[PDB]
Design a protein around this ligand. Structure first.
Ligand code: CTN
Ligand code: MG
Length: 101
């Protein structure tokens, strides 16, 4: 079973180490530094890697930074657009920093 999923269009970015954080809402605020997590694709729940959580922090819509976007391998405009679709109306988020094992 997978502990967490990503949209499959992020799979290669994660395996290549271009994406090293993910921004989630309260439903995934329980992941914490030192967790070792099985990761699957959102679309088919297919496993593709195991990650280690290396850091966590809280962030809000109005405190997301260019650097958060860079670590998501996005522009900031791109990151805000994805959040507006995935977490409509939400402002409180949780940063999970990780590495692919
Ligand atoms: N920063 C983020 C936030 C969410 N997600 C994907 O969207 C699903 C629903 O939140 C999540 O389960 C996850 O698959 C993502 O890929 N990257
Ligand atoms: Mg959109």
């Amino acid at each position: 079973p997978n502990d967490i999923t990503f949209f499959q269009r992020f799979q290669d970015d994660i395996l290549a180490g271009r994406k090293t954080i993910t921004i989630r809402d309260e439903s995934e605020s329980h992941f914490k530094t030192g967790d070792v997590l099985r990761v699957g694709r959102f679309e088919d729940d297919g496993y593709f890697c195991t990650i280690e959580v290396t850091a966590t922090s809280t962030v809000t819509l109005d405190t997301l930074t260019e650097k958060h976007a860079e670590q998501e391998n996005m522009t900031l405009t791109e990151l805000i657009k994805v959040i507006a679709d995935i977490y409509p109306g939400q402002t409180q988020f949780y940063v999970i920093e990780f590495k692919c094992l």
